[PDB]
Design a protein around this ligand. Structure first.
Ligand SMILES: [Fe+3]
Ligand SMILES: [Fe+3]
Ligand SMILES: [O-]
Length: 288
């Protein structure tokens, strides 16, 4: 019928009002956000965009992640404003850069090349990878064939199928970051213990951005073999908060007993992004 489309706009607005309200608990705001991500459309994009001046760097970066995954060019202007705003935390600017790559519209290429030399290393590296992803999409005629995960990833998976050979490529500090990412995604897609353990060695590698991506794909894979390395990374008080957050969230996704102790122990960390990631990860441990 003709009313479903009116009712849906009513529901987007109700949900958006929850997301933008700083008095709602984080978990309720995340539930709103991920619902808007799925619903899509211009109303949803506008509500998501409104929350970019929240105090939570965790929430703000998830806004950007969602805009990227939605692959709707209507988001580009806001994502550009976030990437260029030097008062935004590195992880929020990184997530906006990445999201510009995820949308796959090559109108953003000049801005991404510009921010490829940003003085914030996480931002620079993100944009370098985003440019490589856009150049790959141009060369291959569009997105890679659908893989086992529904996410829009920052690189397409490597062709190499041998887990050992993939591990070597992952851990080789002399290879360009995009090629290492391709190996990372091919390991995730291979799945299983050997791949989980190869990935987990990436938590002891050089770039912060790289180590957070390893955390993310270990949370996607949900293999318990990664737990001790994830927990160890989370426990590093000198580690980049972006990496600690991603490892907390991965622990929440895996949801085994050894994950609980780690997440509980850092629920009161001094780093807000770490506390908040544990808060959401502990809820996930709940529902699993
Ligand atoms: Fe990120
Ligand atoms: Fe993140
Ligand atoms: O992130």
């Amino acid at each position: 019928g003709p009313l479903g489309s009116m009712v849906t706009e009513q529901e987007v607005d109700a949900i958006g009002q929850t997301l933008v309200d700083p008095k709602q608990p984080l978990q309720a705001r995340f539930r709103a956000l991920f619902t808007l991500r799925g619903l899509g459309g211009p109303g949803a994009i506008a509500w998501i965009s409104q929350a970019f001046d929240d105090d939570s760097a965790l929430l703000k970066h998830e806004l950007a992640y969602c805009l990227g995954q939605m692959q709707d060019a209507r988001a580009i202007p806001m994502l550009v404003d976030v990437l260029q705003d030097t008062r935004q935390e590195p992880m929020v600017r990184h997530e906006a850069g990445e999201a510009l790559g995820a949308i796959g519209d090559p109108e953003v290429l000049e801005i991404l090349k510009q921010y490829s030399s940003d003085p914030v290393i996480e931002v620079a590296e993100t944009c370098q990878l985003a440019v490589r992803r856009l150049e790959w999409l141009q060369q291959h005629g569009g997105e890679p064939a659908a893989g086992p995960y529904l996410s829009v990833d920052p690189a397409p998976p490597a062709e190499e199928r041998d887990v050992g050979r993939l591990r070597e490529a992952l851990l080789d500090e002399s290879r360009p970051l995009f090629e290492r990412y391709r190996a990372m995604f091919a390991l995730r897609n291979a799945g299983g213990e050997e791949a989980a353990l190869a990935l987990a060695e990436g938590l002891h590698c050089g770039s912060a951005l790289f180590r957070h991506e390893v955390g993310y794909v270990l949370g996607q894979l949900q293999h318990e073999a990664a737990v001790p390395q994830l927990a160890a990374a989370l426990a590093r008080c000198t580690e980049n908060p972006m990496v600690r957050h991603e490892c907390a969230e991965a622990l929440g996704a895996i949801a085994r007993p050894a994950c609980l102790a780690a997440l509980q122990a850092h629920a009161d960390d001094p780093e807000r992004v770490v506390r908040e990631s544990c808060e959401v990860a502990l809820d996930m441990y709940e529902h699993e």
